[PDB]
């Protein structure tokens, strides 16, 4: 009921087709129980200006919406959701900000859809991937985009959560492996602790 909950906040508070107001929002309702990560986000979107976007984990809508609000008209945010239940949350939500048009939700597991993003979803390679799913799923999607043939020469991944819960052994590979160069991206609580972080990884091929 968490996430419905999250979305009948939304729906009170924020102003229809305002993408801005619903991660705003979210953040209110969700402190309770985010915008210092959301401009680490934001930054990189629009260095990158990523005309096709892979989210792996949809959750409640926000980090899609975050992100499509940021891309080009006709760029194109794909999301990977296992769980349908909070994949119908993910589309009201990204309706309700207006940014429809530029989403589409792909409900299944990402081990499954992965090999099919090219045949299915008319996909040549990905400019961007965002990572925010299930922690322990973080390396072997990396290692199956690579493998699929999804991954080019200046690929962005950026994964969320990489400290807390904290993604160890996705960090390990792409930071030793000299196919990735990263640049680690602090969270500040309050500006005086880091809690968490990201990692942001550009492909450089397999070598
Ligand atoms: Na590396």
Redesign the pocket.
Known sequence: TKEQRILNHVLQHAEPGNAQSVLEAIDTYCEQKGDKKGKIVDAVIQEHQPSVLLELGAYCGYSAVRMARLLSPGARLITIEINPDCAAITQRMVDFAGVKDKVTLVVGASQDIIPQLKKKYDVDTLDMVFLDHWKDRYLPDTLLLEECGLLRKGTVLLADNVICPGAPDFLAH?????????THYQSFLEYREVVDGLEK?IYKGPG
């Open positions: 792409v930071r030793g492996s000299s196919c990735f160069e990263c990884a």
